[PDB]
Design a protein around this nucleic acid. Structure first.
Ligand SMILES: [Ca+2]
Lengths: 112, 110
DNA sequence: CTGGGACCATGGTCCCAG
DNA sequence: CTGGGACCATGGTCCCAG
């Protein structure tokens, strides 16, 4: 289907410049749960540099995207860095699937 | 493609004339767990008279299909009958959705 | 080989209650 | 209006022991 990220991207535009920011209204004219608009929109708030790490945008879950976006609130720069500082390894041939991508990012927020 | 039911017939074709009826094979052919292929195929073995009882083949999930086909192994003549009525009812107004259908089909079983 | 079962994240819904 | 939280069925993987 359509990647949560790209879904959110659209939900966002829709919500902002067509719905006055009333998410109730947006989730109604899409006949979908308010919380869905939310997860998606949230994921879409991640740097496009993070969606890339995944082979396919569809690899990033709406749940895991929303989760990552929260985990890095007021820590945007760390995310961006830890992403590009992880993209360099990707270019160097280094490969990891979606599952780990999300893990290697929240890693810099954990002790070991 | 898409529909659980559709994949059943799709998975069966390859299962039969291509893999001798060796599930483990086709399973490794289309990198996917055996349980999946079992599920979809089983949905396929269901009377088309039941599948066409849903608002769209995708409404009937592999999981509940596999579930149905099982709740009527050796009682298939009970299904068509059970399903036939359901047609009269949705014909004469009555409008049930995805879930309720599987209940109605399974209700006679107990 | 094969089906059964436990397990998993996910998309999604709906309710609670300022 | 809103998010949080409790829930649910799905598709799916994986191990278990004939
Ligand atoms: Ca509506």
């Amino acid at each position: 289907p359509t990647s949560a990220y790209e879904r959110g991207q659209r939900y966002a535009s829709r919500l902002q410049n067509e719905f006055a920011g009333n998410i109730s209204a947006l989730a109604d004219a899409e006949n979908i749960s308010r919380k869905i608009i939310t997860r998606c929109i949230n994921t879409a708030k991640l740097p496009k540099s993070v969606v890339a790490l995944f082979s396919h945008p569809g690899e990033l879950s709406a749940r895991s995207g929303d989760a990552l976006q929260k985990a890095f609130t007021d820590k945007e720069e760390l995310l961006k860095q830890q992403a590009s500082n992880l993209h360099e390894q990707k270019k160097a041939g280094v490969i990891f699937e979606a599952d780990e991508v999300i893990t290697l990012l929240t890693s810099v927020l954990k002790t070991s």
